[PDB]
Design an enzyme around this catalytic site. Structure first.
Site, PDB file in Angstrom:
ATOM      1  N   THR A 138       0.673  -1.643   0.136  1.00 54.72           N
ATOM      2  CA  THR A 138      -0.018   0.031  -0.001  1.00 54.72           C
ATOM      3  C   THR A 138       0.651   1.382   0.021  1.00 54.72           C
ATOM      4  O   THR A 138       1.687   1.528   0.570  1.00 54.72           O
ATOM      5  CB  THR A 138      -0.875   0.011   1.490  1.00 54.72           C
TER       6      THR A 138
ATOM      7  N   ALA B  76      -5.049  -5.407   6.874  1.00 52.90           N
ATOM      8  CA  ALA B  76      -6.315  -5.006   6.387  1.00 52.90           C
ATOM      9  C   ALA B  76      -7.374  -5.319   7.395  1.00 52.90           C
ATOM     10  O   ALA B  76      -8.499  -4.320   7.739  1.00 52.90           O
ATOM     11  CB  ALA B  76      -6.596  -5.769   5.163  1.00 52.90           C
TER      12      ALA B  76
HETATM   13  C1  LIG Z   1      -0.032  -2.550   0.726  1.00 56.28           C
HETATM   14  C2  LIG Z   1      -0.328  -3.586  -0.395  1.00 56.28           C
HETATM   15  C3  LIG Z   1       1.014  -3.361   1.363  1.00 56.28           C
HETATM   16  O1  LIG Z   1       1.291  -2.767   2.544  1.00 56.28           O
HETATM   17  C4  LIG Z   1      -1.200  -2.145   1.774  1.00 56.28           C
HETATM   18  O2  LIG Z   1      -0.720  -2.004   3.104  1.00 56.28           O
HETATM   19  C5  LIG Z   1      -2.290  -3.042   1.863  1.00 56.28           C
HETATM   20  C6  LIG Z   1      -3.139  -2.325   2.909  1.00 56.28           C
HETATM   21  C7  LIG Z   1      -4.620  -2.644   2.743  1.00 56.28           C
HETATM   22  C8  LIG Z   1      -4.995  -3.773   2.072  1.00 56.28           C
HETATM   23  C9  LIG Z   1      -6.433  -4.042   1.932  1.00 56.28           C
HETATM   24  C10 LIG Z   1      -7.300  -3.281   2.724  1.00 56.28           C
HETATM   25  C11 LIG Z   1      -6.908  -2.279   3.579  1.00 56.28           C
HETATM   26  C12 LIG Z   1      -5.412  -1.953   3.795  1.00 56.28           C
HETATM   27  N1  LIG Z   1      -1.997  -4.313   2.782  1.00 56.28           N
HETATM   28  C13 LIG Z   1      -2.339  -5.302   2.161  1.00 56.28           C
HETATM   29  O3  LIG Z   1      -2.696  -5.769   1.200  1.00 56.28           O
HETATM   30  C14 LIG Z   1      -1.927  -6.270   3.236  1.00 56.28           C
HETATM   31  C15 LIG Z   1      -0.505  -7.024   3.077  1.00 56.28           C
HETATM   32  C16 LIG Z   1      -0.009  -7.537   4.358  1.00 56.28           C
HETATM   33  C17 LIG Z   1      -0.390  -8.610   4.878  1.00 56.28           C
HETATM   34  N2  LIG Z   1      -0.037  -8.922   5.979  1.00 56.28           N
HETATM   35  C18 LIG Z   1       0.491  -7.700   6.514  1.00 56.28           C
HETATM   36  C19 LIG Z   1       0.359  -7.025   5.341  1.00 56.28           C
HETATM   37  C20 LIG Z   1       0.782  -5.682   5.381  1.00 56.28           C
HETATM   38  C21 LIG Z   1       1.530  -5.113   6.392  1.00 56.28           C
HETATM   39  C22 LIG Z   1       1.705  -6.066   7.429  1.00 56.28           C
HETATM   40  C23 LIG Z   1       1.278  -7.317   7.552  1.00 56.28           C
HETATM   41  N3  LIG Z   1      -2.980  -7.641   3.120  1.00 56.28           N
HETATM   42  C24 LIG Z   1      -3.647  -8.000   3.828  1.00 56.28           C
HETATM   43  O4  LIG Z   1      -3.559  -7.706   5.014  1.00 56.28           O
HETATM   44  C25 LIG Z   1      -4.717  -9.397   3.701  1.00 56.28           C
HETATM   45  C26 LIG Z   1      -4.485  -9.753   2.176  1.00 56.28           C
HETATM   46  N4  LIG Z   1      -4.526 -10.469   4.553  1.00 56.28           N
HETATM   47  C27 LIG Z   1      -3.853 -11.668   4.359  1.00 56.28           C
HETATM   48  O5  LIG Z   1      -3.306 -11.874   3.252  1.00 56.28           O
HETATM   49  C28 LIG Z   1      -3.791 -12.545   5.157  1.00 56.28           C
HETATM   50  C29 LIG Z   1      -3.891 -12.657   6.416  1.00 56.28           C
HETATM   51  C30 LIG Z   1      -4.532 -11.230   7.283  1.00 56.28           C
HETATM   52  C31 LIG Z   1      -4.017 -13.701   6.975  1.00 56.28           C
HETATM   53  C32 LIG Z   1      -3.677 -14.732   6.082  1.00 56.28           C
HETATM   54  C33 LIG Z   1      -3.420 -13.901   4.935  1.00 56.28           C
HETATM   55  C34 LIG Z   1      -3.583 -15.801   6.484  1.00 56.28           C
HETATM   56  C35 LIG Z   1      -3.815 -16.322   7.782  1.00 56.28           C
HETATM   57  C36 LIG Z   1      -3.991 -15.445   8.746  1.00 56.28           C
HETATM   58  C37 LIG Z   1      -4.356 -14.085   8.413  1.00 56.28           C
END
Ligand SMILES: *[C@@]([C])([C][O])[C@](*)(=O)[C]([C]C1=[C][C]=[C][C]=[C]1)[N]C(=O)[C]([C]C1=[C][N]C2=C1[C]=[C][C]=[C]2)[N]C(=O)[C]([C])[N]C(=O)C1=C([C])C2=C([C]1)[C]=[C][C]=[C]2
Ligand SMILES: [Mg+2]
Ligand SMILES: [Mg+2]
Ligand SMILES: [Mg+2]
Lengths: 244, 250, 222, 240, 211, 233, 231, 235
Positions: free
Chosen positions: E1, E49
């Protein structure tokens, strides 16, 4: 169930008084008179032991005057056992403050804390209040020499001179008459003993029927000394003031 | 279930009296006479072994009890209440003092702890006051010999000599005439036996009288040798024979 | 050391139409390289015209669906048999997932139904409650194989109108239920070829104003 | 724990314990509050049955809850300390969590809520206290004056009195206080507050306490001599 | 993001990308990273997210209760602080959040940065996310207080574009918001694919790329 | 969290036209030591259900007691305990599945793999699996541990899909199960020759066979095998 | 008299007055009727209003797809007990995949009410319930009293003037039990039964409340113009 | 003495019946439901002229679509309002929607009988809960300390309740407009109030689908009072 046997210690009367507090004050009015007098250069605490015996070991006895810390003392009027519970709590509170802030506890703060504990027993818990009235004599560097009193209601007030226990009405009148603002400790000692001598229910006021204590800046240079008088020392001050 | 008596059973009456404490003191008055006398080199505490039945072995019932090696206790009033107080007094001497300072408490502080327990039964929820007055005799290094009375209210007073229970008023008068500040321990025992004979009706001997002293250290009663500083308990219960010997010179 | 999680494979697919919605998933259940069942249902009718599938760790998926079905039941008791809207269900499911933020449900969840205007709706969830409404979504083992195909054939991505040469995009014409089921069957047939955890059977649940209908199709059993 | 229901309804729909708590307030020393155009004044009675008192150290009747809000009371003194302590803690808790000092209305609502809670909780009796809470909201120049009572009801007042003989001083305020034109200055506001207490107090010596609160945390307590000058001027005009 | 926000003469601009990532796999390209707390309050999402979504909706409810009790809209400072104190309970427990609480209150336009680490900072310009570092270059060089609403919206949009281009984990589309004293105004969804080519041609930038 | 100590190997089962069959050997292994030779791992519940358990034997004995207590509890204030309100295979399974998933969620699992085999009130065949993770599934054939790898392939040749169930008789199904148990004895190092077999039929009820042995084994070809490559003698 | 201050006190004749006073609250409540055949079970309830501007208090509560009850007395107590039944029915489904037997549902209500009659501080429930349901042993009707007593019956009625309807059902016993595979005729018999408890007022469209459960019939409640058919 | 949760020989809870007597002593509150909206009005009843009447808050917002008027021991209502506001907002958190007026009322009424020896006594206040939702439209409920709630087309609570209710019996019909309902509340309040009704000692409010819950200004109410006087003098 158990409701049948509950006296309900924490309720108002129709007149807006607390039954148990008023009855506790009635108990205290039969206790030995205690007097506190504040002077410009110190404080006096005088108190009358209740109908003693010749076989009572006086020099090791303590029923009226207690030490809370090096700067603060209290005169008791009421149930001694109840007072000792509170006295130990106050001693702990003074040490907690000293540990926390590395300064001796201000007199009022200690007094407020004890008075708040007494208040709690009148508002919640369903237990009888403490049948005790204190006279607090103490010193700190903010207000200097201070006299306070607290009673079972948990209400406390500051005084120049005050009495608790028996015959306080008569005692307070005598103090109000002879007390002056520019008074000194030696004069206050005389006033306290003269007031007890006139208000006492006993035939004559003797050394064996008294507890006495002073808080003086009469310590070598800028510092405060507590003197709990010994039996022989009470005997001498009775002769000096011209009572015996 | 649950203890739903969370309120006080002792309360102030309109006159300022705490009824249950007064009634507890009345129970003490009905109790068998016990007394204590302080000498220059010791203290004595004594009472009558009022046996409920001659088939009962009165040796098994101990009215005079060791609290610490240098502190003893006797009572007047309700026996069962005394027995549990002795159990608690023994325990509190360890938990609130010996386990902290590595030595037994001085008489006045152990008395203070017992007093506290009796005060709490006078204010806490769902309990009545203890129906006993205690006489606690003891010795410690910095205060010397001492004798204390403890009442149902929790109040305690130090005495040169005193008596509690049935014939206390007469016994206290008897002690006032005989007591002085130059009494040796044997003189105090003699006076104790004289005072106690007045309140006893029936048999008056070593088997019907219970008497103990706080006096000199008893190395023979210590149970071990090798440590010079440990010289033994000052508390000693007089035997049936030892009492009878002093009744011939009475 | 005890591992409380597992992987039961499987893949699911939700597509939203103009007045309908489908939720498809294969019927294969697996551990490692073994097959547990060739037919173990993974997509469920949860009530109120809502279908649901929690794909990943089957024990956590079964528990979540079971809890949401229970949530629908109590929504009726507490709010006078009111119909639970798809957007309200999605928000409720978020709170079911995040209630275990520190010991998650290891599943990717998809629900499908109709919104309050009668239009097709698909919602997708992450294992800890982040949800979003979408037109098209594949989840599970072969999600990465299928989604790019859907971007191309449902949303017409990277597709332009001939003659213009990249100046004018392909217009976003809605799809029919018959056209959608074709994309679903081709998606799963392609995924079955290239993913070992996908196969055996395909069960599709279609949601319209008339109700919830089922369709079953066989897949390769290798 | 002690769970006994002390505050309960009676056949005629009254909670006697709450009503008996009002009788404790009736016994308490008189307290008065008057708000002017740009200030609020809190007056308090000190009963002269207690002489030989040390006025330096004796608990003052008016208590600061924060730098911009004050609280006076009538009723049980010991009970008032508990409410004041709770109020002071909440005032700091509000600053700590919301980064703004409490409004006078908020602080009053909290104190009143505490009082109410003690009218339907097991094992406790109502507070035998009515309070007058006065001050100025942060970055505001409109004076605020509220009252609370044991039942837990609260309301805003142009001017109000509580405690013993409060019926008399309220009578005085109702005819003397004009809403269309309130005390324009501090002098006029203090004068009216002293005048109102002089209907009840007895002697105008050490029996009257006055505390003036102005905007922007400007709070000061008047001395004996300053108050005595008001007492002198009032009676000299009265001799006519 | 990539997310950003900045205060200026006529309020506060708030912009964000729409990409969601699960490793190298692009899970979604249509996500909403701006959150509607109330008509005068926005919140950004970066990091977890689920975490960001759950706690800011929890905040929004908290803010609504505040309005009911106090008959007054919550301040930006108090709102940001409620969030900060809420997430501080769970410090070291694994939460991942980087948010900005943007709004207009009695003090004027307000902007606070809040994260799961415990920071709570007031500032005129913020950008958080993996692409924040690319966005800051465009902001810092072109940011003024006396900025027109038209130019300010473009700056926030152009800044996301810079990051979306370079950062692999940023892209999809640009969501724009403008917060006024009369409330926030949504200024549309802008696909980066189409926006990039447009900006390249009109501005002349991205010369190294061929189109 | 723990580790299994005394363990039981494969449990195998399949559906046939009128009911279900389930089998398991009588061994309790202590690692590589074939410690206990008289262990019953098929536990009947009423006359319509058999629960087959593999994994930790101490946890098996715990489950065996839960089931025994379940029957006792079901009879309480229940005049129809031996009729309409008797315990069903589906009730027994869901109870176990609830317990297994709860225990794994407390990170203190029952280290087992369970197959509940039975016939319902309406005559329908019941066959479902559950394990230490709370993972559940149903299939025409089910097997645990080594059985999943070796027995299922053999049993699926008889009943490959749902439509093959009515075409399968009890003689054919039992024959397949008995053959699978022989194969497991050839190839599973933690198996025994002695085993138990249970049939639950909708007509003939519950038949519980004990002290069965693997027979008709092929070993004669071993005499011809010499060395590991080049050796001739 | 001296023995009615709390629920923990027997009278000298072995009576529990607080329980008897709770029983009295049911008699003040509006009439409700219960009856069943071998295929179906029916609840009929006369709803009560505060005045002409007010709504008619709901009497029937659904517990599960196969079970529910009608109330008479303190409505909040019925909400508490019905909530408990909802949970118990639900526990049976989630844990055992089993529909809760109506007889066992009655045993659970009995035991819940009993605890309130033997302990200090609490009070008995001030409501009577008629539980109907269809389980594996067919149709069922139960009567619950807050003393704890639960009784399985062919038909019954509770509330004010309930003796009239109870007598009618005692005569009609042989007829309505045979009404199998005919829901409308079984309801007719229930509506005719509750009519024997009416005085002055009659059954109107917003006054009457009916519920039914059966072999292929989930527990459903009929109110408003849906019961005009039976008036 | 006697238990707090004790039944009388008639089968009523003593404490609940006694709390109803306290509500009869309270100031009057009236509610009228129409197809154009629900109107809520109250008597302020200031104890003294120095009391700033605008601080008297007897009409209260629970949510944008739900309002509430009170009568009786008004201090007891604060924790009920707090619970209601929490319940309304919490449901919006869990379900992303407005909460049904009936469900909100049921949540408030669940607190009622949570007393014993939980709180030490029943609430001494009655509430008129008015609101709108998509399922059942404009609604008015009367929540008592017994835990019972009735829906009403029109309802009056407080000291002049039985006199006002009889008047509402005759005046209410299903085709009432919002303006007509406003004047009707003012009319009946003026009839049962001790002091003369004006904009300072009485307060109006309403709930509409479009604008939501609104407390009326004193200037707006003053015009409706003047409009009432003229139409009564018209015949
Ligand atoms: C940028 C793409 C990367 O920083 C941005 O931060 C987005 C923010 C965002 C996305 C959607 C809605 C609101 C904000 N972030 C993501 O796309 C994140 C990437 C991420 C995953 N973990 C994490 C991230 C970033 C920073 C710290 C930690 N995506 C997610 O949060 C989603 C896609 N979750 C997961 O992929 C999973 C989670 C939660 C989870 C998984 C996968 C498996 C088992 C337990 C939990
Ligand atoms: Mg005692
Ligand atoms: Mg294969
Ligand atoms: Mg917070």
């Amino acid at each position: 169930g158990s409701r049948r046997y509950d006296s309900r210690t924490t309720i108002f009367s129709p007149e807006g008084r607390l039954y148990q507090v008023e009855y506790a004050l009635e108990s205290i009015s039969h206790a030995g008179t205690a007097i506190g007098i504040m002077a410009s250069d110190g404080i006096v605490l005088a108190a009358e032991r209740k109908v003693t015996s010749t076989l009572l070991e006086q020099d090791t006895s303590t029923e009226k005057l207690y030490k809370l810390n090096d700067k603060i003392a209290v005169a008791v009027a009421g149930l001694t056992a109840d007072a000792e519970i509170l006295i130990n709590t106050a001693r702990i509170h003074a040490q907690n403050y000293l540990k926390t802030y590395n300064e001796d506890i201000p007199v009022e703060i200690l007094v407020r804390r004890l008075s708040d504990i007494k208040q709690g027993y009148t508002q919640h818990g369903g237990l009888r209040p403490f049948g005790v009235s204190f006279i607090y004599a103490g010193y700190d560097d903010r207000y200097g020499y201070q006299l306070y009193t607290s009673n079972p209601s948990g209400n406390y007030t500051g005084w120049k001179a005050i009495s608790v226990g028996a015959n306080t009405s008569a005692a307070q009148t005598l103090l109000q008459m002879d007390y002056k603002d520019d008074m000194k400790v030696d004069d206050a000692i005389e006033l306290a003993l003269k007031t007890l001598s006139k208000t006492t229910d006993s035939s004559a006021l003797t050394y064996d029927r008294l507890e006495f204590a002073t808080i003086r800046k009469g310590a070598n240079d800028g510092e405060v000394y507590q003197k709990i008088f010994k039996p022989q020392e009470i005997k001498d001050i009775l002769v000096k003031t011209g009572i015996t | 279930m649950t203890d739903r008596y969370s309120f006080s059973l002792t309360t102030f009456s309109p006159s300022g009296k705490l009824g249950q404490i007064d009634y507890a003191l009345t129970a003490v008055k009905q109790g068998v006479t016990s007394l204590g006398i302080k000498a220059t080199n010791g203290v004595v505490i004594a009472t009558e072994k009022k046996s409920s039945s001659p088939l009962a072995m009165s040796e098994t019932l101990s009215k005079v009890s060791l609290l610490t090696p240098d502190i003893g206790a006797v009572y007047s009033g309700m026996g069962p209440d005394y027995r549990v107080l002795v159990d608690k007094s023994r325990k509190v001497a360890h938990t609130s003092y010996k386990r902290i300072y590595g030595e037994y408490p001085p008489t006045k502080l152990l008395v203070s702890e017992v007093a506290k327990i009796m005060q709490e039964a006078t204010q806490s929820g769902g309990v009545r006051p203890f129906g006993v007055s205690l006489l606690i005799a003891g010795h410690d290094e910095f205060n010397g010999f001492s004798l204390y009375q403890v009442d149902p209210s929790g109040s305690y007073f130090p005495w040169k000599a005193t008596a509690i229970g049935k014939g206390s008023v007469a016994a206290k008068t008897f002690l006032e005439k005989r007591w002085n500040d130059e009494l040796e321990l044997e003189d105090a025992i003699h006076i104790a036996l004289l005072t106690l004979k007045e309140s006893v009706e029936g048999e008056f001997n070593g088997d019907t009288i219970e008497l103990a002293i706080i006096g000199d250290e008893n190395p023979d009663l210590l149970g071990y040798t090798g440590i010079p500083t440990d010289k033994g308990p000052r508390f000693r219960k007089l035997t049936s024979q030892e009492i009878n010997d002093r009744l011939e010179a009475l | 050391q005890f591992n409380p999680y597992g992987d039961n494979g499987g893949t699911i697919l939700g597509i939203a139409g103009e007045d309908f919605a489908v939720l498809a998933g294969d019927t294969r259940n697996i551990t490692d390289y073994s097959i547990n069942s060739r037919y173990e249902p993974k997509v469920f009718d949860c009530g109120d015209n809502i279908v649901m599938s929690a794909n990943g760790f089957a024990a956590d998926g079964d528990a979540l669906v079971k809890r949401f079905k229970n949530s629908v039941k109590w929504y009726h008791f507490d709010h006078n048999d009111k119909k639970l809207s798809i957007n309200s269900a999605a928000r409720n499911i978020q709170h079911l997932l995040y209630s275990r933020r520190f010991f998650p449900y290891y599943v990717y969840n998809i629900i499908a139904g109709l919104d309050e205007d009668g239009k097709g709706a698909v919602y997708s969830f992450d294992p800890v409650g982040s949800y979003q409404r979408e037109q098209c979504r594949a989840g599970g083992a072969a999600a990465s194989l299928i989604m790019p195909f859907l971007d191309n054939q449902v949303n017409f991505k990277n597709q332009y109108e001939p003659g213009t040469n990249g100046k004018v995009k392909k217009p976003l014409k809605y799809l029919s239920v018959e056209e959608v089921i074709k994309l679903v069957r081709d998606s799963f047939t392609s995924a079955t070829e290239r993913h070992i955890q996908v196969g055996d059977g395909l069960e599709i649940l279609i949601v319209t104003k008339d109700g919830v209908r089922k369709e079953f199709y066989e897949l390769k059993r290798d | 724990g002690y769970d006994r229901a002390l505050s309960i309804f009676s056949p005629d729909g009254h909670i006697f314990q709450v009503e008996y708590a009002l009788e404790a307030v009736k016994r308490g020393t008189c307290a008065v509050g008057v708000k002017g155009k740009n200030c609020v004044v809190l007056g308090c009675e000190r009963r002269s049955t207690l002489k030989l008192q040390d006025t330096r150290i004796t608990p003052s009747k008016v208590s600061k809850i924060d730098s911009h809000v004050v609280l006076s009371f009538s009723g049980l003194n010991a009970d008032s300390r508990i409410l004041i302590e709770k109020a002071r803690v909440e005032a700091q808790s509000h600053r700590l969590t919301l980064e703004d000092p409490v409004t006078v209305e908020y602080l009053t609502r909290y104190v009143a809520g505490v009082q109410q809670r003690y009218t339907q909780s097991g094992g406790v009796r109502p507070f035998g206290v009515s309070t007058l809470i006065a001050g100025f909201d942060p970055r505001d120049d409109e004076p605020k004056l509220y009252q609370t009572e044991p039942s837990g009801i609260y309301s805003s007042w142009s001017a109000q009195t509580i405690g013993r003989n409060s019926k008399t001083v309220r009578e005085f305020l109702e005819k003397n206080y004009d809403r269309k034109e309130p005390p324009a200055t501090v002098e006029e506001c203090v004068k009216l507050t002293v005048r109102s207490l002089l209907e009840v107090v007895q002697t105008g010596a050490k029996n009257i306490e006055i505390t003036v609160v102005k905007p922007d945390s400007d709070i000061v307590a008047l001395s004996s001599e300053e108050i005595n000058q008001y007492v002198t001027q009032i009676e000299q005009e009265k001799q006519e | 993001t990539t997310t950003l926000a900045f205060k200026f003469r006529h309020g506060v601009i708030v912009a964000a990308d729409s990409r969601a990532t699960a490793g190298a796999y692009i899970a979604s390209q249509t996500v909403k990273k701006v959150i509607e707390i109330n008509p005068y309050l926005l919140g950004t999402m970066a990091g977890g997210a689920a975490d960001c979504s759950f706690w800011e909706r929890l905040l929004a409810r908290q803010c609504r209760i505040y309005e009911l009790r106090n008959k007054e809209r919550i301040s930006v400072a108090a709102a940001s602080k409620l969030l900060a104190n809420m997430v501080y309970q769970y410090k070291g427990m694994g939460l991942s959040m980087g948010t900005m609480i943007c709004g207009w209150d009695k003090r004027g336009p307000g902007l606070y940065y809040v994260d799961s680490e415990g920071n709570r900072i007031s500032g005129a310009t913020f950008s958080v996310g993996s692409g924040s570092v690319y966005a800051y270059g465009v902001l810092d060089s072109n940011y003024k207080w006396d900025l027109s609403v038209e130019d300010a919206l473009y700056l926030g949009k152009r800044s996301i574009l810079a990051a979306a281009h370079r950062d692999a984990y940023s892209g999809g589309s640009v969501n724009l918001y403008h917060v006024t004293e009369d409330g926030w105004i949504y200024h549309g969804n802008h696909d980066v694919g189409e926006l990039f080519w447009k900006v390249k041609e009109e501005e002349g930038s991205f010369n190294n790329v061929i189109g | 969290t723990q580790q299994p100590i005394v363990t039981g190997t494969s449990v195998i089962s399949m559906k046939y036209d009128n009911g279900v069959i389930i089998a398991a050997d009588n061994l309790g292994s202590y690692g590589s030591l074939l410690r206990f030779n008289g262990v019953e791992r098929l536990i009947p519940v009423g006359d319509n259900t058999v629960v087959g358990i593999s994994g930790d034997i101490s946890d098996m004995q715990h489950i065996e007691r839960l089931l025994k207590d379940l029957v006792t509890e079901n009879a309480y204030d229940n005049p129809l305990a031996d009729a309409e309100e008797a315990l069903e295979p589906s009730y027994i399974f869901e109870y176990l599945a609830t317990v297994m998933y709860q225990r794994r969620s407390k990170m203190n699992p029952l280290w087992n793999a369970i197959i509940v085999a039975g016939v319902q009130s309406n005559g329908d065949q019941f066959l479902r699996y559950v394990n230490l993770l709370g993972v559940t599934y149903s299939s025409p054939t089910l097997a645990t541990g080594f059985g999943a790898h070796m027995a299922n392939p053999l049993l699926r040749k008889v009943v490959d899909r749902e439509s093959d169930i009515p075409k399968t008789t009890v003689q054919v199904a039992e024959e397949a199960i008995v053959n699978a148990m022989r194969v497991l004895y050839y190839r599973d190092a933690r198996s025994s020759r002695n085993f138990s077999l249970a049939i639950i039929d909708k007509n003939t009820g519950l038949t519980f066979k004990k002290n069965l042995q693997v027979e008709n084994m092929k070993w004669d070809f071993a005499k011809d095998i010499k060395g590991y490559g080049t050796q001739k003698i | 008299n001296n023995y009615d201050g709390d629920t923990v006190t027997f009278s000298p004749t072995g009576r529990l007055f607080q329980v008897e006073y709770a029983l009295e609250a049911i008699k003040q409540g509006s009439v409700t009727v219960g009856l069943r055949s071998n295929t179906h079970a029916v609840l009929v309830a006369l709803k009560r209003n505060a005045d002409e501007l007010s709504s008619y208090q709901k009497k029937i509560i659904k517990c599960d797809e196969h079970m529910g009850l009608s109330l008479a007395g303190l409505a909040p107590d019925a909400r508490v007990l019905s909530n408990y039944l909802r949970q118990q029915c639900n526990y049976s489904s989630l844990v055992f995949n089993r529909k809760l037997a109506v007889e066992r549902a009655g045993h659970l209500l009995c035991d819940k009410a009993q605890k309130n009659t033997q302990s200090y501080g609490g009070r008995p429930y001030g409501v009577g319930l008629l539980i109907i349901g269809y389980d594996k042993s067919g149709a069922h009707l139960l009567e619950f009293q807050p003393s704890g007593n639960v009784t399985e019956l062919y038909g019954t009625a509770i509330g004010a003037r309930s003796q009239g309807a109870k007598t009618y059902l005692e005569r009609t016993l042989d007829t309505f039990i045979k009404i199998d595979g005919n829901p409308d005729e079984l309801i007719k018999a229930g509506v005719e039964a509750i009519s024997q408890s009416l005085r002055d007022e009659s059954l109107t469209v917003d006054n009457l409340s009916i519920a039914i459960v059966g072999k292929d019939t989930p527990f459903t409640i009929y109110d408003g113009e849906a019961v005009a058919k039976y008036i | 003495d006697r238990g707090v949760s004790t039944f009388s020989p008639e089968g009523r809870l003593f404490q609940v019946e006694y709390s109803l007597e306290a509500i009869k002593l309270g100031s009057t509150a009236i509610g009228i439901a129409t197809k154009e909206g629900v109107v809520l009005g109250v008597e302020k009843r200031a104890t003294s002229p120095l009391l700033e009447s605008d601080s008297i808050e007897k009409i209260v917002e629970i949510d944008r679509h739900i309002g509430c008027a009170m009568s009786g021991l008004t201090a007891d209502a604060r924790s009920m309002i707090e619970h209601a506001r929490t319940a309304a907002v919490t449901h919006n958190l869990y379900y992303d929607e407005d909460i049904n007026v009936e469900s909100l009322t049921q949540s408030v009424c669940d607190l009622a009988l949570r007393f014993g020896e939980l709180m030490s006594r029943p609430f001494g206040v009655a509430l008129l809960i008015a609101g709108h939702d998509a399922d059942d439209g404009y609604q008015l409920f009367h929540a008592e300390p017994s835990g019972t709630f009735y829906r009403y087309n029109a309802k009056a609570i407080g000291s002049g309740s039985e006199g006002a209710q009889a008047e509402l019996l005759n005046e209410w019909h299903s085709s009432l407009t919002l303006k007509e309902a406003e004047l009707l509340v003012l009319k009946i309040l003026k009839q049962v109030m001790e002091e003369k009704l004006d904009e300072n000692n009485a307060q109006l409010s309403c709930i509409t689908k479009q604008d939501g819950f609104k407390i009326y200004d004193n200037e707006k109410t003053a015009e409706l009072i003047k409009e009432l006087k003229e139409k009564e003098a018209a015949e």
